[PDB]
Symmetry: C2
Subunit: 153 residues, 2 copies
């Protein structure tokens, strides 16, 4: 089994810790933790290609997408590797994250260790928003917080 972790920070109040665990190669990755400082409701949540935060979250590049597929929802066959389920913040601005995803991985071609996890300003429209931008980014707006995904004990 493999574990990873990410500390999310930004220029506003959004901050969080997200854990990843994968019991076996190509198996589901469990994703969990808490993010605070968010507006109530849904927020886009993606793995971006680069673990480069030299210019903040902007330097993380696009969604992790090694086969140049369209942006989609987590359950779509046509999705980027980095297209995780939206997180949901409650009335106190807290998202308690509970995700299982079988497209991301902690080894192999879909490995996300060393890449950037980003939480967004708005909801990800899952590629279903009816404009081209939707099938590139999900229209999730700005990058509010992020961090590089690291190997954990």
């Amino acid at each position: 089994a493999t574990k990873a972790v990410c500390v999310l920070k930004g220029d506003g109040p959004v901050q969080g810790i997200i854990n990843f665990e994968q019991k076996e190669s190509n198996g589901p990755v469990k994703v969990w933790g808490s993010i605070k400082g968010l507006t109530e409701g849904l927020h886009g949540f993606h793995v971006h290609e680069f673990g480069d935060n030299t210019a903040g979250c902007t330097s993380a590049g696009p969604h992790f997408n090694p086969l140049s597929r369209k942006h989609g929802g987590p359950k779509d066959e046509e999705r980027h590797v980095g297209d995780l389920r939206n997180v949901t913040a409650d009335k106190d601005g807290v998202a308690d994250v509970s995700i299982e995803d079988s497209v991301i991985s902690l080894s192999g071609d879909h490995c996300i260790i060393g890449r950037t996890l980003v939480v967004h300003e708005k909801a990800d429209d899952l590629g279903k928003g009816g404009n081209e931008e939707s099938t590139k980014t999900g229209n999730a707006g700005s990058r509010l917080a992020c961090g590089v995904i690291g190997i954990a004990q």
Copy 2:
């Protein structure tokens, strides 16, 4: 060729950006960039095992050392994978880093992507200090700044 990058931060004083590049599998890695906010002179410079910054630099674990070797100098056959050359800060507290290291890698068993780079309070004694601690950590004192090593474009 593969590139990686690391943003070093701690609690305010010490800040830096370090780049990594490796032309081929098993080949030397070039390490370069700049760190500011240091006292003049030598500072230990290590890759630690875990890319876990949940408790700041403390949660990075020990030096990256997959074969349970002794701590050494970078040119020693017996060293941890993470034992890089000390960095040297000038009289203004700036270390211009220029390293070539043949033991670290950006792929394979010695891969450091997803692990933590750490710069220290004191010089690493290269495992040639006067106590048993020397051959574990190099007696480099506190972890002044760190970051997770991420994949770069």
